Symmetry: C3
Subunit: 186 residues, 3 copies
């Protein structure tokens, strides 16, 4: 009913984690479901390169995904980590965007606006079965990368362990992280 | 229509400080009907020097109490929240209330009464950028405060840290907490 | 209609103690169809001395396995839940996607949701319970078309309880990609 905006359930490599790299090195599953005045979100990232799939050979690691949308809620693929636009399940996608009233854009470097953040946790299950917490930070709007952009949504997964989940290459998977935010008018 | 809320960016509407006379904080609360459950979203922002200095202590508790009449309208005299919720689609808000079958009222006896509680976690980001977990307790119904009340929803954010997050005044903001509960019939 | 569930306050309908003949617990499971996903809500309540004494130990693992047929109905012989879910109205559309979460023959960890809920002990102490949800992945038989398993784990320095007390897992919410209607 128009109510789902997503990457599909099992997307091909569509996302770039590694700075400078020219083609997707990861698979971002992102699902945004419109429900009343909020969006319910579901996001998981799967590695698809040796670089991404060896990140957890280190104890401290940060993975950033930046999504920038235009005025009609379509991805700007050049600047975004995600290189393919989201699609509706069943035209404008403005109504899935984060509210600029609840999560306003602010003056670039003036004060602090922690009103624009969602924090949470998901996990990485290592090849030996050990489960490591990943701290999740979602930033909504707040700040523009350029003057072409109308909406912002960034994800940061952060691991800080006494130990490195891995000593070898292993398929990176962030366990599903769910979240909700106040959506813009349709 | 299927959303009952305070709006996305409410003016000070909630009293934290005991004895205080007018709102000292901004409560954002959004309740969305989703089949037989409600999906909830809640965050609290400080709007007074008292609230905005609580995090100078390492152990803090913040209580918000909401009491609703038989048609799911706030009772402002007894509730922490002094302005009623409104529907996005401008009748009864009964269908948004926590089920008295799932979350019963019981005799005022000491006890854990676990069935009436939802536990979870949200966060406070301090001025220095440090992230503090806040333990969240949601109580549904369980204890009637008087003969005027038909539904109860209370929130507690607890901080118990080894170090206080702040040494100075800073805008208190609870990162968004989401939860779901079984709702009453419309 | 858009809700598939046990109901809000079910009678004993679930078996936790392996080999036991009848329900020893009350599983509340609520699955709401929301666009391309299901939003789930699950809590377990003990209803036997065995279940209600588990938390006298520091290490506790509670497992529930749900096996569904092709039209999304519980297989009670093999499932921990002995009564089928009901619509508030085929429930295939409520089932976990075999595209997102495929069955496989034996590393494959995309089939897991991890999280936390809690147990409040009689003395008021709050204990976190580590939650693992597994979707499909392992096919036990030919009668089964979808799998949904829950594991609640406590590993504590100390035991929530010295005596019998009603086991209640605080509500755990989760979301997964659903199969086509």
């Amino acid at each position: 009913k128009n109510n789902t905006l997503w990457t599909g359930p099992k997307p091909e490599a569509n996302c770039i984690i590694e700075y400078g790299k020219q083609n997707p090195d990861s698979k971002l599953t992102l699902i945004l479901v419109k429900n009343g005045g909020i969006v319910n979100g579901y996001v998981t990232l799967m590695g698809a390169s040796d670089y991404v799939n060896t990140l957890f050979k280190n104890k401290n690691v940060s993975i950033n995904v930046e999504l920038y949308f235009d005025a009609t809620g379509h991805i700007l693929p050049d600047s975004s980590s995600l290189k393919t636009d989201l699609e509706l399940e069943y035209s404008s996608a403005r109504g899935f965007m984060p509210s600029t009233t609840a999560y306003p854009f602010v003056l670039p470097n003036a004060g602090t606006h922690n009103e624009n953040y969602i924090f949470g946790q998901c996990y990485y299950k290592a090849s030996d079965g050990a489960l490591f917490p990943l701290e999740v930070t979602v930033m909504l709007n707040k700040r523009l990368p350029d003057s072409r952009t109308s909406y912002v949504m960034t994800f940061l997964w952060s691991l800080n362990a006494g130990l490195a989940p891995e000593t070898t290459q292993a398929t990176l998977i962030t366990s599903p992280f769910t979240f909700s935010y106040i959506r813009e008018d349709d």
